[PDB]
């Protein structure tokens, strides 16, 4: 909103979600992308989904007039991005690639600040519903927690035994454990 940056930042697109409606009232659309310079990776929120044609994995692009908010890079207009032979010689080290695509271990999430936004792929082991919310027990070789889903994302067909890709969920805690709560910009799909 006031963390505005002129750019341009020159990045390779690593991964993208399909576009989706995050405000059902006015059919507002967005998608999520992970991108990288040669030394850093960035999580991007694209609110002009006309840009879907440019956030293709392995495309190299230049991002201008973007905003930093809550640890994301926000893009609001198609004019922010250009993609014609910006740096056909870009190399993304394999270490930076896997760092960009890594899922945090559940035990590591317990050490993190409540309210940070988390992305990760986890195995579901229990499903229960109550009062329009839906609670997914997830775990790994380090611990267990609940994914709390409410609203538009309750329509995602998911039962125990499925693997869940979570994008931009909020890390919270209660006296009974830790949770990843769906929020306005969240996205999820089963694999």
PDB file of N, CA and C in Angstrom, residues 5 7 12 18-19 24 35 45 55 71 80 87 94 100 104 108 127 156 165 173 175 184:
ATOM      1  N   UNK A   5       7.537  -0.405  -5.024  1.00  0.00           N
ATOM      2  CA  UNK A   5       8.852  -0.550  -5.637  1.00  0.00           C
ATOM      3  C   UNK A   5       8.738  -0.330  -7.133  1.00  0.00           C
ATOM      4  N   UNK A   7      10.934  -1.247  -9.441  1.00  0.00           N
ATOM      5  CA  UNK A   7      11.460  -2.295 -10.288  1.00  0.00           C
ATOM      6  C   UNK A   7      12.316  -1.674 -11.368  1.00  0.00           C
ATOM      7  N   UNK A  12      12.876 -15.636 -12.888  1.00  0.00           N
ATOM      8  CA  UNK A  12      12.341 -16.820 -13.533  1.00  0.00           C
ATOM      9  C   UNK A  12      11.135 -17.325 -12.745  1.00  0.00           C
ATOM     10  N   UNK A  18      -3.391 -22.176 -10.780  1.00  0.00           N
ATOM     11  CA  UNK A  18      -4.459 -21.708 -11.641  1.00  0.00           C
ATOM     12  C   UNK A  18      -5.074 -20.457 -11.018  1.00  0.00           C
ATOM     13  N   UNK A  19      -5.763 -19.643 -11.807  1.00  0.00           N
ATOM     14  CA  UNK A  19      -6.484 -18.517 -11.214  1.00  0.00           C
ATOM     15  C   UNK A  19      -7.735 -19.008 -10.499  1.00  0.00           C
ATOM     16  N   UNK A  24     -16.040 -13.707  -3.907  1.00  0.00           N
ATOM     17  CA  UNK A  24     -17.135 -14.235  -4.712  1.00  0.00           C
ATOM     18  C   UNK A  24     -18.172 -13.177  -5.048  1.00  0.00           C
ATOM     19  N   UNK A  35       8.673 -17.177  -7.743  1.00  0.00           N
ATOM     20  CA  UNK A  35       9.639 -16.713  -8.744  1.00  0.00           C
ATOM     21  C   UNK A  35      10.994 -16.563  -8.068  1.00  0.00           C
ATOM     22  N   UNK A  45       1.676 -12.525  -5.450  1.00  0.00           N
ATOM     23  CA  UNK A  45       0.230 -12.478  -5.595  1.00  0.00           C
ATOM     24  C   UNK A  45      -0.101 -11.634  -6.816  1.00  0.00           C
ATOM     25  N   UNK A  55       2.964 -15.960 -16.534  1.00  0.00           N
ATOM     26  CA  UNK A  55       3.509 -16.731 -15.422  1.00  0.00           C
ATOM     27  C   UNK A  55       3.439 -18.220 -15.770  1.00  0.00           C
ATOM     28  N   UNK A  71       4.889 -10.114   3.297  1.00  0.00           N
ATOM     29  CA  UNK A  71       5.842 -11.094   2.804  1.00  0.00           C
ATOM     30  C   UNK A  71       5.602 -11.553   1.380  1.00  0.00           C
ATOM     31  N   UNK A  80       2.544  -4.207 -15.430  1.00  0.00           N
ATOM     32  CA  UNK A  80       3.667  -4.361 -14.512  1.00  0.00           C
ATOM     33  C   UNK A  80       4.712  -5.352 -15.013  1.00  0.00           C
ATOM     34  N   UNK A  87      16.340 -11.986 -20.099  1.00  0.00           N
ATOM     35  CA  UNK A  87      17.632 -12.576 -19.762  1.00  0.00           C
ATOM     36  C   UNK A  87      17.639 -14.057 -20.122  1.00  0.00           C
ATOM     37  N   UNK A  94      20.250 -25.280  -8.348  1.00  0.00           N
ATOM     38  CA  UNK A  94      19.361 -26.334  -7.877  1.00  0.00           C
ATOM     39  C   UNK A  94      19.080 -26.189  -6.387  1.00  0.00           C
ATOM     40  N   UNK A 100      13.151 -22.947  -2.837  1.00  0.00           N
ATOM     41  CA  UNK A 100      11.932 -22.236  -3.210  1.00  0.00           C
ATOM     42  C   UNK A 100      10.698 -23.124  -3.126  1.00  0.00           C
ATOM     43  N   UNK A 104       7.714 -26.608   4.695  1.00  0.00           N
ATOM     44  CA  UNK A 104       8.244 -26.550   6.063  1.00  0.00           C
ATOM     45  C   UNK A 104       7.811 -27.773   6.863  1.00  0.00           C
ATOM     46  N   UNK A 108       8.959 -27.432  12.643  1.00  0.00           N
ATOM     47  CA  UNK A 108       9.527 -26.110  12.409  1.00  0.00           C
ATOM     48  C   UNK A 108       8.461 -25.026  12.467  1.00  0.00           C
ATOM     49  N   UNK A 127     -10.499 -36.247   8.647  1.00  0.00           N
ATOM     50  CA  UNK A 127     -11.403 -35.191   8.212  1.00  0.00           C
ATOM     51  C   UNK A 127     -12.619 -35.180   9.125  1.00  0.00           C
ATOM     52  N   UNK A 156     -13.521 -28.110  -1.937  1.00  0.00           N
ATOM     53  CA  UNK A 156     -12.439 -28.910  -2.501  1.00  0.00           C
ATOM     54  C   UNK A 156     -12.607 -30.341  -2.005  1.00  0.00           C
ATOM     55  N   UNK A 165      -1.977 -29.563  -1.170  1.00  0.00           N
ATOM     56  CA  UNK A 165      -1.090 -28.440  -1.441  1.00  0.00           C
ATOM     57  C   UNK A 165      -1.770 -27.183  -0.917  1.00  0.00           C
ATOM     58  N   UNK A 173      -2.294 -20.541  16.679  1.00  0.00           N
ATOM     59  CA  UNK A 173      -2.328 -21.544  17.728  1.00  0.00           C
ATOM     60  C   UNK A 173      -3.500 -21.283  18.659  1.00  0.00           C
ATOM     61  N   UNK A 175      -4.850 -23.210  22.684  1.00  0.00           N
ATOM     62  CA  UNK A 175      -4.283 -24.051  23.732  1.00  0.00           C
ATOM     63  C   UNK A 175      -4.320 -25.535  23.373  1.00  0.00           C
ATOM     64  N   UNK A 184      -8.405 -15.040   3.240  1.00  0.00           N
ATOM     65  CA  UNK A 184      -8.978 -14.472   2.019  1.00  0.00           C
ATOM     66  C   UNK A 184      -8.198 -14.856   0.752  1.00  0.00           C
TER      67      UNK A 184
END
